């Protein structure tokens, strides 16, 4: 089997700059004038899209910002300039021999400017409390970079181990992320306390932003 070593596993490139992704094969992909190296672009939720075949044949419909090159065992795809719609995972694949093999993939993160999140907190609904469970949700909206430090506070006491988070894929338009954290407590534990807060520390914030509500109010 022809093993394809794709590097780097991930990289962050600002718009306008150059992204360079490499693919090294365990043996030559040349065969009677051909270099059967194929590059694909896969955006989240979508199937892969063929960018380049024959190592350097830019497919019809793909912008000229993409270019492939190389021969034998060393190949390269370049994105110049990188655009914000280029946020995806890119794979190399050889069609020289069977079995067909893919590279490990390279996740391209669009490095935009710093963006502080807009923070929102949501109390559990009266309808859910009837089931004996309380879900408190905190929203961190449209921020960059992805590294966001947040913490739940119940009566000013830091929480841990009782929340789950979910993060959206990088937005194709503004290159930001959004994060939702759900704090799960029993109804009895929820009634035992008053102040529920979500505290966010981010690179774009001058001071940590805290959103909170009092259980009884509103």
């Amino acid at each position: 089997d022809i093993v394809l070593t794709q590097s780097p596993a991930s990289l962050a490139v600002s718009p306008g700059q150059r992204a360079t992704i490499s693919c090294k094969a365990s043996q030559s992909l040349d065969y009677e004038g051909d270099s059967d190296m194929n590059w694909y672009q896969q955006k989240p939720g979508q199937p892969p899209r063929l960018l380049i075949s024959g190592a350097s044949n830019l497919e019809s419909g793909i912008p000229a910002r993409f270019s492939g090159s190389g021969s034998g065992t060393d190949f390269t795809v370049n994105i110049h300039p990188v655009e914000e719609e280029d946020a995806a995972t890119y794979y190399c694949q050889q069609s020289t021999e069977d079995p067909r093999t893919f590279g490990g993939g390279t996740k391209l993160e669009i490095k935009r400017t710093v963006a502080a999140p807009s923070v929102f907190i949501f109390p559990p609904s009266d309808e859910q409390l009837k089931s004996g469970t309380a879900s408190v949700v905190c929203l961190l909206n449209n921020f960059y970079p992805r590294e966001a430090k947040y913490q739940w506070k119940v009566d000013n006491a830091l929480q841990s181990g009782n929340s789950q988070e979910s993060v959206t894929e990088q937005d194709s338009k503004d290159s930001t992320y959004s994060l939702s954290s759900t704090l799960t407590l029993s109804k009895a534990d929820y009634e035992k306390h008053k102040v529920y807060a979500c505290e966010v520390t981010h690179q774009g914030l001058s001071s940590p932003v805290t959103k909170s509500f009092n259980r009884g109010e509103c």
Binding site: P48, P99, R100, F102, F120, V137, V167, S178, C218
Partner: protein
Amino acid sequence: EVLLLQSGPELVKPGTSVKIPCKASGYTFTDYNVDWVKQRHGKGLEWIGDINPNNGGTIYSQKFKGKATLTVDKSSSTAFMELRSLTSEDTAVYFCARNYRWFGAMDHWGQGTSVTVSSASTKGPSVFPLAPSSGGTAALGCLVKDYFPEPVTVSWNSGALTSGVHTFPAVLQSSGLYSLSSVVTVPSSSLGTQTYICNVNHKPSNTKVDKRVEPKSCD
């Protein structure tokens, strides 16, 4: 032009088999081979096999011998893949792709069939409102909680509201049920002029829930 149509997401039980279709159109079906590619959640692509519709000749990856079976129906221009003795290791998205038998790249792909292998029962979701309390921009949403299997679709105002919508990836709770939130940011002044309704559709259980998110005026 060239279209490869696969079936939608499917929940299957372990110890059973499943047959995934890939209906082709927009080109000469017998002129191209059909390959199948497996992708686990958050992972890469791994090649399953290859079939020539002209004669039915198949080439399998060694890793899938005895697990995957590739067939074609020339008259209906459809390729099939059957997975046997299903386990949780088979839970993945399976793509079909068009390629030339002679060193051809995979230039057109199906949209992928998301197969979930689990013995858990189908469960419809509960929809709870994420209501804001009265800045300049407000956020509201819906908590779609305790359902199985994936996926659920969430639209806002029957699809009329799309800007600012963030529907997060589902998370698997310790109970074994999924849960996700869908939020949208709107002008605060619109909380009194616009009605905001989240439309949740859970096709595996034929559940359609519409939930109005009523804000709370709080001095």
